[PDB]
């Protein structure tokens, strides 16, 4: 997030980090319950990857994080790779997350929910803070 | 790429107003946010865009795409969860 700030450690409990077996953080994600993760379908997640939960500082070693294994990648069939439309995939965890003070689910809206333009919202992540 | 988690507050835009920046790339299952001095960037994809509805944070968008430079004057594009939640519910229910 270019021009963002550092977050309060543990303040966004649903935020996860998708890392390949090399340890490289390539995408983010959101926990919707102890067994399901939501991320972008374009992330190209495979079952060989890992979901990291309860992480704040990717460079710390004393963090009691949760390295979670992916059972199945559920790419939304409407997903259009040429347009990047309907960019969503569900990740079914083989090993369910352990909810705590730093690990929990974000709520999902009604198909009918309204989010008016002008509403200030929040986005999080470990993306580049500078290009 | 920062070691620790970043956060940023940002306004949602209307698709129409967003189309002024992106044209016909902006589809119905997409929602725009940003062009406010901040910007999502490479490595943020799959991440959450949340709004507090009734005291609880609710997943409104999924960090999708945007400016290749991550320009803070250009609105980022996120997957519109509102138009995708039915697929989610159906998929959770059957697996």
């Amino acid at each position: 997030i270019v021009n963002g700030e550092e977050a309060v450690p543990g303040s966004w409990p649903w935020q996860v980090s998708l890392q390949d077996k090399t340890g490289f953080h390539f995408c983010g994600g959101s926990l919707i319950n102890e067994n399901w993760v939501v991320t972008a379908a374009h992330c190209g997640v495979t079952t060989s990857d890992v979901v990291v939960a309860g992480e704040f500082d990717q460079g710390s070693s004393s963090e009691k994080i949760q390295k979670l294994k992916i059972a199945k990648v559920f790419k939304n069939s409407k997903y259009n790779s040429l347009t990047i439309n309907n960019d969503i995939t569900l990740l079914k965890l083989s090993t369910a997350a352990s909810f705590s003070q730093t690990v929990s689910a974000v709520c999902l809206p009604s198909a009918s929910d309204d989010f008016a333009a002008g509403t200030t919202c929040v986005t999080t992540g470990w993306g580049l803070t500078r290009y | 790429t920062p070691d620790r988690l970043q956060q940023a507050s940002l306004p949602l835009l209307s698709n129409t107003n967003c189309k002024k920046y992106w044209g016909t790339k902006i589809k119905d299952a997409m929602i725009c946010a940003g062009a406010s001095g901040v910007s999502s960037c490479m490595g943020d994809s799959g991440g959450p865009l949340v709004c507090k509805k009734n005291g609880a944070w609710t997943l409104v968008g999924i960090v999708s795409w945007g400016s290749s430079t991550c320009s803070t004057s250009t609105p980022g594009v996120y997957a519109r969860v509102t138009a995708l939640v039915n697929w989610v519910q159906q998929t959770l229910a059957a697996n």
Partner: peptide, 10 residues
């Protein structure tokens, strides 16, 4: 869901 045990500060 949606209400963190550690409250975020903006």
């Amino acid at each position: 869901c949606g209400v963190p045990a550690i409250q975020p500060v903006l």
